Design a protein around this ligand. Structure first.
Ligand code: MN
Lengths: 98, 342, 217, 98, 343
DNA sequence: CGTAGCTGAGGACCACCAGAACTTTTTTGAAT
DNA sequence: GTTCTGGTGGTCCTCAGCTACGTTTTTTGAATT
C-alpha cells in the first residue's frame, strides 16, 4: 500500500539489561526506517513489512518495563506532516539526485 | 500488481557505497553523506568513479536490485549480474523456442506490430491535436502506408524478411521526426533522428534515454527469471545489446522519443545546458543532467491505465508487466505474446 | 538406487486442495511470495519448531518435528507433533518394550474450513505412520490458533482412497511439468501469488480479438 | 472537529538558554494534551486550538537550533493507534470515571 | 596465485586489488604485497572480505574481463561485467549437449571412470597402509572387479547401461567402507545405508559432508559461467543442481569419505556430541557441528599437487580449477575432461 | 569490509526543592 | 494555593573507540470468512 507510519519507543535502561535492549531495538528499527528525532522514527511500509517489523520488535522489548507506540497516517501523508525546526529529513518521493 | 520503487542516482565522484544491516550508506573520505533503507529502493545508478563493497553487491544481487556504473554522460559500464535461482523449465523453454524459425517469426511479428502501431498512432495523435503548426496531408499519407505494412507484418514467416521491413519502418519515419519540433528550432540544432556515436548536439538526451531504458528493461527481465538481450528474437551478432531494446521497441519509439520531444517543446531545457568539446563531441552540464533526471522521474511517477483490464498502473511498471506476460506465454497460458498498443 | 529423488513433500498436499494452480506455482516454478497472513503463520511455525530437545512430560510423549517418509504413496516430509500414549493394545516402538499409540497433531492458523484443505495433510501423515508399521489408527487431532481449539478427526477408507488417488494424480501432473488453469472465484483475492498467478487470464477475449480490434481501428 | 494531534519536540540544551526553552516548551505543550513518552505529546483538539498551539510554539522556540514536528491522525484515531508496552494513556472519549 | 589457466585466484583475505598502468597490484594493508601484468588475463576471482579499486573495475570491464567476488568460505557473492562475454555461447552449448544423449553419455562415463579410479586406488592405498587386521584377498578381488567395471564403463554407450553398471560398484564400495574403519569400530557402525531420515550415526557425517561438497561444487559451477541446474547424467528436476551432483559423484571419494574416516580415526570426534531421537537420525550438537566445520576448513587449507597441471595448490581450489577445464572442453579447446586419470 | 560484544563521553528529558511575588483603562479581530 | 526562576540528581539515548571473528543440510507457510 506504500503508507507512512511512525514508531516511538521508550526502553528503561536502568534494568538489568536495558542498554543491550536499547541497542538491539534501535538497530532493528533503523533497518526498516529513517530516523527523524531521538527515539522517533518514520518510514514508508506496506502491510507485510509493518507486520514483519511488529513481530520482530515485539520480541526484543520486555513488557512491564518498556513502551512502544506505532501510528499510521495513510496514503495522503504529504498533508498531515509539518516540520518547523532545523532537523530536515530526506523525502522518499524525491528523485534522490545525490 | 507490484508497486514501483524509487531509484538512487549517484552523481558525485570519488564516493563509496557500504552496507549496514538493510541500509545503503554513502561515504566520501570517512564522512557519512547519507543512508537510505534498501527495502524501498529498486536500482542504484552511479556516475564517475564510484566503488561498492562486495557485501552490498551480493545483497543487491540476491534481493533483485540492479547496480550500474556510468561515465560522465551515461556510458554503460560494468553492470552487476547475479546468480541462477532455479525455474529450470522456464529457462529451458526460452532457450528451446530460440534456434527455431516458426515461433521466432511469430513473436517478431508481434513485436514489430506493436512498434509500428505505436509509432503510427503517436504521429496520428500529434497531427490530430495541432493541425496548424505542421503539414497534415503528408502525415496522413505516411500513416496510411504504415497501415499496409501492418497487414504484411502479420503475413510473414521468416526472420530474414522482417529485418528488411524494419529498414523500411526506419526510413519511412525519419523524415517525419525532423518536422516534429515546434519551438527552439534555431537554438537546438535539430537534424531529425540522425545519430553519431561522437554525438552532434540534440542527441545527448536521446542517447541517455536509450541507455536508461536498456538498463531498466534488462533489470526487469532479469527479475522474472529470463534473459532477453541476445536470444530468440534479435540478431546473433555479438555486441548488439538490442533485444533488451527490441522488447521495448514498442516503447523506445514512444516512451523515450516522446519524453525528449516534450522536453524540447515545453521550454524545459535551454540551449545553455549543452556545450561542445574540442574534438567536436557534445556534453551536458551537471545542472542540465540533474534537470533531465528530475523530469524523467516525474514522468515515471504519474499513472496510466493498461488496455487489457483497465487497472491503474505506472509508467515504470510498463516494462516489468510486458516481461511478466512474456513469461506466461512461455507457459502456454496465452496464444502468443500480446504487445503494448496505444 | 535413488529412491529419494521421486519423493515429494507433505506441504504439497494442502496447496493441492485450494487453488490447484497454486501448488504448481510453488513446487514446479519454484516461486513464492509472502503477505500479511503468511508472516504470522511462519512466525508461529518457527516458535513451535523446537527440535534437538525432547520435551518429555510424564508417561506420554509429545515428540516434535518428526521426519516422515512413505513408499506406497511415495511422499516425504516432516510431521509437526506426535503424541505417544501408553496402551496395552498398541504396537511396540523400536528400542523400548511395550506398546504406545502414536496420535498425530498438526498446528495451523485459522478457523475450520469446509473444503477440507487441512484434513488431507493430517490423513497423509497418519497414513505414513501406519505404513511405517502397516497398522490401523482411527484417531487424529488438529489445532487452531486464533480460536485456540483442538478438534478430533477420525480417518476411514473414504479418506484413504482419496489421498492415494490424490498422490497418484499429483505425481502424474508433476511428471509432465504442467501447470493447470482453474476457476478463480472470490478466494483468489487472498492467495499469496496474485502478482504471479494472474487470475484474470481465464476470462479474456484472447489475442485474436485484439488483432481484429487493431484491424477495426 | 476533535481530531487527534501528536507533537514531538527536540530542543538543544547545550546552547545558552536551552533549559529555559525546554521548560517553556514542556509547559506550553502540557496545557493541551497528555504525555505518552518523553518529548512526545498527544491531544484531542479542534482546528482553532491547533492553530493557537502552533502559533504559540512557533513564537516560543528559536530557529536554526530546535526541532518541532506536528502530525494529525484525523477523526478516525481509534483504529490507527497501537500500543504494546506498559505505559497506558488515558482516553478522553470514554465515560472517564475517576 | 596466477594459475597456468589464464585466471587469478587471489585467496588471502584482507587484501586490496588496485590498478597501476596496465598491471594489477595486491596491497596488504597499505604495503605493496604483489604485482602482476594484466595482458594475458581472461578472468579474475577474488576470495575473502576484500574489495577492488574503481579504476581497476573500469579497466577490466571494458576489455572483456569479468570480475567475480566471493566470500572467504566459498559462497558466491557477485559478478561484475559489462556486455557479457564467453557466457552465452557456453550456456548454449551446455543445454544443446544436455538435450542430446550421446555427448551426455560420454561425459557421464568419463565422470564414472574418474569415480571408480578414485575408489580403486583408495582401496589399494588402504590395503597397503595398514596390512595388519583387514581382509586382504577380499580387497584384491574387489580391486580386480572394479578394474573390469573400469573397462566396461570405458566401453559404455547409453544412459541406462551406464547407470546400471555404475550402481553395481556402489554396493561393493559400501561393504568395503563398512570394513574400512579401524579406530572406534566397536562403537561406530555402518551395517546399512539410508538417506532422507538418516538412520544411524555415520549416515549423518556422510550426509553433512555431502551437502557441504554440493554447495562448494555449485559455487564452482556458478563462478565459471556454466549452468548448475542443467546436468548431463542426472536428469532435470526443478530445484536440484544436476551438474553439481555430477561433479559431486565424481569427487565423492578422497574429498568426502576420507574426511569422515579421518574424523572417526585419530580420536578427533566422539559420541557425546551426537544424539538419537526416536528414528535413528543424528541431530548433531552445536559443538559437534562447530568442530566439523573447523575440521572441514582445516582440510581445505591443506596443500597438494594437481596430477594433471602439476602446479601446487590448496584443496579448496581443486573443484574450481576442475570446473574451468569443463568450460574449456565446452569451448572446443580440449578433447576430454580427465578429473583423475592417466589418459 | 561487516557483525557482534564491551566500554567511555557527553547532550536531552523530567522530577524535586527553595525563594519571591500575586491589581493596568479601552480598543481591534476572518469572510474561496 | 498558583506562577516563575534557579539549582541538582537521576535517567534515556546516540556516537566514537577497541577486540574478535565471519560456513549450517531440508521441509513448512494464508486463503470463500
Ligand atoms: Mn503447523
Amino acid at each position: 500500500g506504500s503508507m507512512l507510519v511512525l514508531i516511538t519507543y521508550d526502553v528503561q535502561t536502568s534494568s538489568m539489561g536495558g542498554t543491550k535492549r536499547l541497542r538491539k531495538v534501535a538497530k532493528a528499527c533503523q533497518n526498516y526506517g529513517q530516523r527523524v528525532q531521538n527515539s522517533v522514527f518514520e518510514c514508508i511500509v506496506d502491510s507485510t513489512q509493518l507486520t514483519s517489523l511488529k513481530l520482530e520488535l515485539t520480541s526484543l522489548i520486555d513488557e512491564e518495563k518498556d513502551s512502544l507506540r506505532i501510528y499510521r497516517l495513510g496514503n495522503n501523508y504529504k498533508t498531515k506532516v509539518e516540520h518547523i525546526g532545523a532537523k530536515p529529513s530526506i523525502d522518499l518521493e524525491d528523485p534522490l539526485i545525490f | 500488481m507490484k508497486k514501483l520503487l524509487n531509484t538512487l542516482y549517484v552523481t558525485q565522484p570519488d564516493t563509496y557505497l557500504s552496507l549496514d544491516g538493510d541500509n545503503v550508506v554513502l561515504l566520501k573520505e570517512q564522512e557519512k553523506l547519507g543512508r537510505l533503507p534498501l527495502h524501498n529502493l529498486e536500482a542504484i545508478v552511479g556516475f564517475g568513479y564510484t566503488g561498492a563493497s562486495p557485501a552490498l553487491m551480493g545483497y543487491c544481487a540476491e534481493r533483485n536490485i540492479s547496480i550500474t556504473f556510468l561515465t560522465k554522460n551515461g556510458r554503460f559500464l560494468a553492470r552487476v549480474v547475479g546468480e541462477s535461482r532455479g525455474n529450470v523449465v522456464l529457462r529451458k523453454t526460452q532457450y528451446r523456442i530460440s534456434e527455431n524459425d516458426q515461433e521466432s517469426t511469430k513473436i517478431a511479428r508481434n513485436f514489430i506490430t506493436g512498434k509500428v502501431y505505436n509509432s503510427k498512432w503517436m504521429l496520428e495523435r500529434m497531427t490530430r491535436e495541432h493541425p496548424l503548426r505542421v503539414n497534415v496531408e503528408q502525415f496522413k499519407a505516411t500513416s496510411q502506408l504504415l497501415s499496409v505494412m501492418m497487414q504484411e507484418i502479420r503475413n510473414c514467416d521468416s526472420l530474414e524478411s522482417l529485418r528488411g521491413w524494419e529498414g523500411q519502418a526506419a526510413i519511412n519515419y525519419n523524415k517525419v521526426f525532423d518536422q516534429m519540433i515546434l519551438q527552439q528550432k534555431e537554438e537546438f540544432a535539430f537534424h531529425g533522428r540522425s545519430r553519431r556515436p561522437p554525438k552532434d548536439n540534440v542527441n545527448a538526451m536521446l542517447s541517455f534515454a536509450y541507455t536508461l531504458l536498456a538498463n531498466d528493461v534488462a533489470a526487469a527481465l532479469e527479475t522474472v527469471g529470463l534473459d532477453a538481450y541476445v536470444g530468440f528474437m534479435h540478431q546473433d551478432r555479438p555486441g548488439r545489446a538490442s533485444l533488451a531494446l527490441d522488447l521495448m521497441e514498442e516503447l523506445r519509439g514512444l516512451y523515450a522519443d516522446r519524453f525528449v520531444l516534450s522536453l524540447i517543446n515545453r521550454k524545459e531545457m535551454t540551449a545553455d545546458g549543452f556545450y561542445k568539446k574540442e574534438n567536436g563531441a557534445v556534453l551536458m552540464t551537471d545542472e542540465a543532467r540533474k534537470t533531465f533526471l528530475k523530469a524523467w522521474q516525474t514522468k515515471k511517477q504519474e499513472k496510466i491505465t493498461h488496455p487489457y483490464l483497465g487497472e491503474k498502473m505506472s509508467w515504470g511498471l510498463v516494462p516489468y508487466v510486458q516481461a511478466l506476460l512474456l513469461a506466461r506465454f512461455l507457459r502456454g497460458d496465452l496464444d502468443e505474446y500480446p504487445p503494448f498498443l496505444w | 538406487s535413488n529412491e529419494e529423488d521421486r519423493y515429494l513433500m507433505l506441504s504439497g498436499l494442502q496447496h493441492f486442495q485450494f487453488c490447484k494452480r497454486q501448488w504448481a506455482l510453488i513446487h514446479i516454478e519454484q516461486q513464492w511470495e509472502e503477505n500479511v497472513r503468511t508472516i504470522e503463520g511462519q512466525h508461529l511455525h518457527k516458535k513451535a519448531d523446537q527440535p534437538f530437545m525432547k520435551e518429555k512430560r510424564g508417561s506420554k510423549l509429545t515428540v516434535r518435528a518428526m521426519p516422515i517418509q512413505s513408499k506406497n504413496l511415495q511422499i516425504s516430509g516432516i510431521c509437526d507433533v506426535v503424541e505417544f500414549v501408553q496402551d496395552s493394545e498398541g504396537i511396540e516402538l523400536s528400542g523400548v518394550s511395550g506398546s504406545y499409540k502414536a496420535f498425530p497433531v498438526e498446528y495451523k492458523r485459522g478457523k475450520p474450513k469446509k473444503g477440507d484443505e487441512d484434513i488431507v495433510q493430517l490423513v497423509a501423515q497418519a497414513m505414513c505412520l501406519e505404513e511405517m508399521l502397516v497398522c490401523r489408527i482411527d484417531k487424529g487431532y488438529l489445532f487452531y490458533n486464533e480460536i485456540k481449539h483442538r478438534v478430533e478427526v477420525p480417518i476411514t477408507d473414504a479418506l484413504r482412497d482419496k489421498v492415494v488417488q490424490m498422490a497418484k494424480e499429483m505425481h502424474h501432473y508433476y511428471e509432465n511439468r504442467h501447470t493447470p488453469k482453474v476457476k478463480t472465484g472470490p478466494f483468489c483475492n487472498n492467495c499469496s501469488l496474485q502478482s504471479i498467478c494472474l487470475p484474470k487470464l481465464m476470462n479474456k477475449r484472447s489475442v485474436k480479438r485484439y488483432i481484429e480490434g487493431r484491424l477495426s481501428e
